[PDB]
Design a protein around this ligand. Structure first.
Ligand SMILES: [Zn+2]
Ligand SMILES: [Zn+2]
Lengths: 427, 155, 145, 48
């Protein structure tokens, strides 16, 4: 029954994620009717909203817990399988764990060093002959006892489990980004019972919940590296203007209202810098809007050129750069999509001869892509080769399997299709 | 059998003649699995593979076209279960390879998640580029998709 | 229907000016830029609404005492207490003021939450008045391209 | 303009070799012919 329950939880991960999102939306919509006198809820001539928030919060916490269980039971095996495959290939080919011995850097390898000693090291890679292969290839160079020591194979209780492999798996799933995001979701949902306003932070799930919103938000993320540098450049420029203003025009920054008020000014550097960052980049017209004009002063022309240069170098150029980064992001994304479409429509993926050679036959290129060189056909062939005992392999199947084990990929056609090699008319 | 079965002794009477496994004059659960389930599934598949191999390897043969056209029913039934790939043979010549495609895998490849993963893989390959790394990336994607379909088979 | 209703009230004939959208071919190319990316414009507006709501929640929880609209001292205290009033205030003022919400609220001159208010105003400005508008113009530019 | 210049440079470097510029289409007959040609036959480092 537990296995069936876990399979049911895994099968409906996305549906219950959307359910959690809708529940959070409902909680926020109810949250919108607060009022202070302390923080009592006001209802539109009703009294049935008193437990609706509580039951919705309980439902949200339960659904979020089910979401994290389903994610741990469905998407985690992909991460484990990828990590095991990568470490197995590295150990078999490079042999870095016995030759290179990586340093304190590359923490991933150091953490993966804890899985070699485990008995069930290829738990998901379906290739349990990796230890035998590495022994057969390294025994005559690194001995036999050293490799054996390094590998180290020698409903009531169920205590016969490998705790080292479980610890390594728990370590490697904690560093995953999606699991960390789900843990943050758990923390926010749990904290929502202490304070009802903590459920507002769950609205950020719409950033990744909708595909059409990820394309919008990818424009900012595409050039997000340069946006912070632009902000830093703006901060440096504002600081330089602050230094000039403090050194020369310190007497203008006086905020006196209708005469008879105490003289409030900006004397020290920190106050002037906060004034320039808070006002002047915000006023829409630079710093000259909120300072008195130099009507009849010896520094009038200097103040005028200072204001004009500050405006033209902060409010115009920097903002133009900030919008330009987003515009270039949109253009780059569209150009990449167009290039991908053209590359897929102008040559086939496997050998890439080109459609011009296949246009001699009517609809030749479409037939070639759909029958001769098809990605689905290659994937099905690879799966059928994997899920087949070696005793039943034919000559071609054994040949392909041997090159797949050696990982040479000379059997993939490249620049030579069936029509090019075996012409219909003998020549 | 009144849709596509014609009233002839060789076909209509044949099923009734083969329905001699019960003395109670009624059908049973074992009839449709004893026959036409374990045989006539891989036996006919090999015949279809042989016929299509002969047709592809000997184009424009007058005698072979009649054979292809008379046996169109079996080949049409075996269209979804036929795989056609091209590999570089041991004799430095392109050789066709035929195999069997399982029905569950065929269903599992039409899911939107697998199509989205394939589209993302193509996008990443074209963006990053490379030729030697291209086949390694393709094989890695194939292995990941195979593992995902095997995991999703356990519903 | 609009032409018939124009006899009951003479101002109902003003709605017939919208026929110029499809009456001229050279105007359809102009109006097709908005329609080309019209699917994403409403999503951008919704994202803006969500961001403004989050800022509203933060302001209500922390800086509720600053939203006081008192004129020349001797006036009754008009404030934004409940969530609905603060949300309407943020959607009506702050996305419209050209400089965020800090223009229409008194500055924290000598307060314990001064730096928090300053970073709140700066983040609201940089995340609503600049980035969202940049996206809105970017959609139209990409449509033209 | 900067992005277009970078894209043009990348395409020009990936579509023909620097020295003689025959084009990758002629070298595609041999498997991985163009990469081998650029890395061994016409290499800028080798000439330098
Ligand atoms: Zn091809
Ligand atoms: Zn050359």
């Amino acid at each position: 029954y537990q296995q069936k329950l876990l399979n049911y939880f895994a099968r409906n991960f996305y549906n219950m994620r959307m359910l959690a999102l809708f529940v959070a939306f409902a909680i926020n919509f109810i949250l919108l009717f607060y009022k202070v006198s302390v923080h009592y809820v006001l209802e539109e001539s009703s009294g049935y909203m008193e437990p609706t928030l509580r039951i919705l919060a309980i439902l949200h916490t339960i659904i979020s817990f089910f979401c994290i269980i389903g994610y741990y039971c469905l998407k985690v095996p992909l991460v484990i399988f990828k990590r095991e495959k990568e470490v197995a290939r590295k150990l078999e080919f490079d042999g870095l764990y016995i030759t290179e011995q990586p340093s304190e850097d590359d923490i991933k390898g150091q953490w993966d060093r804890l899985v070699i000693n485990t008995q069930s090291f290829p738990n998901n890679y379906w290739d349990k002959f990796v230890k035998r292969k590495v022994m057969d290839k390294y025994g005559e160079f690194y001995g036999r006892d050293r490799i054996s020591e390094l590998l180290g194979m020698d409903s009531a209780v169920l205590n016969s489990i490998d705790v080292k492999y479980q610890m390594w798996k728990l370590g490697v799933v904690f560093t995953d980004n999606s699991f960390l995001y789900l843990a943050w979701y758990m923390t926010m949902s749990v904290l929502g019972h202490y304070n009802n306003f903590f459920f507002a932070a769950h609205l950020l799930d719409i950033a990744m919940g909708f595909k059409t919103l990820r394309t919008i938000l990818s424009s900012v993320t595409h050039n997000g590296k340069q946006l912070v540098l632009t902000v830093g450049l703006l901060a440096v420029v504002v600081y330089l203007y602050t230094v000039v203003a403090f050194n020369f025009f310190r007497k203008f920054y006086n905020k006196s209202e209708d005469g008879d008020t105490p003289d409030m000014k900006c004397d020290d550097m920190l106050t002037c810098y906060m004034f320039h960052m808070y006002v002047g980049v915000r006023a829409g017209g630079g710093i000259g809007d909120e300072i008195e004009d130099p009507a009849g002063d010896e520094y009038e022309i200097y103040r005028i050129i200072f204001d004009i240069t500050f405006f033209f170098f902060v409010i115009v150029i920097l903002l133009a750069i900030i919008q330009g980064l987003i515009i270039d992001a949109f253009g780059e994304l569209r150009d990449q999509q167009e290039q991908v479409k053209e590359d897929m429509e102008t040559k086939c993926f496997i050998c890439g001869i080109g459609n011009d050679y296949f246009d001699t036959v009517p609809h030749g290129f479409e037939t070639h892509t759909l029958q001769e060189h098809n990605l689905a056909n290659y994937l099905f062939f690879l799966m059928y080769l994997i899920n087949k005992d070696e005793t039943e392999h034919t000559g071609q199947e054994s040949y392909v399997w041997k090159m797949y084990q050696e990982r040479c990929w000379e059997f993939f056609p490249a620049g030579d299709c069936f029509r090019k090699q075996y012409e219909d008319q003998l020549n | 059998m009144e849709s596509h079965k014609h009233y002839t002794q060789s076909e209509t009477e044949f099923l009734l003649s083969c329905a001699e496994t019960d003395e109670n004059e009624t059908l049973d659960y074992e009839e449709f699995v004893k026959r036409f389930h374990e045989p006539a599934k891989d036996i006919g598949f090999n015949v279809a593979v042989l016929l299509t191999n002969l047709s592809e390897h000997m184009p424009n043969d007058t005698r072979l076209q009649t054979f292809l056209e008379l046996a169109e029913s079996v080949l049409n039934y075996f269209q979804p279960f036929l795989g056609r790939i091209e590999i570089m043979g041991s004799a430095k010549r392109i050789e066709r390879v035929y195999f069997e495609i399982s029905e569950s895998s065929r269903t599992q490849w039409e899911k939107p998640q697998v199509k989205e993963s394939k589209r993302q893989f193509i996008f990443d390959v074209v963006n990053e580029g490379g030729e030697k790394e291209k086949m390694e990336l393709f094989v890695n994607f194939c292995e990941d998709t195979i593992f995902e379909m095997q995991l999703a088979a356990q519903i």
